[PDB]
Amino acid sequence: GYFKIYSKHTPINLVRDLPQGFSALEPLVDLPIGINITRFQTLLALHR
Amino acid sequence: YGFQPTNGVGYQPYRVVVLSFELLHAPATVCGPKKSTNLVKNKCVNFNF
């Protein structure tokens, strides 16, 4: 019943591929909400 | 209703609120303030931080 979100921001100079490096992800937030999630979506910001 | 100042007991308007809780269904979010003591140092004590 806990939704855990961890996050990290990292500036990159390489163009496309993922970097050859290591960096931990510090915890961001916990939510005490009980939902039986099984699928999800994504949001985009288009130019109308 | 016929609430009037001259009315006696059993007729004067009353304001009543009933409070309801839940029993072990979701993680708690509203609870009584746990009391706190001060801090001692350099003494063999027991703590509940």
Ligand SMILES: *[C@@H]1O[C@H](CO)[C@@H](O)[C@H](O)[C@H]1NC(C)=O
């Ligand atoms: C998981 O799904 C079941 C029904 O398939 C539901 O009864 C239960 O509450 C769900 N669990 C959570 C944490 O929402």
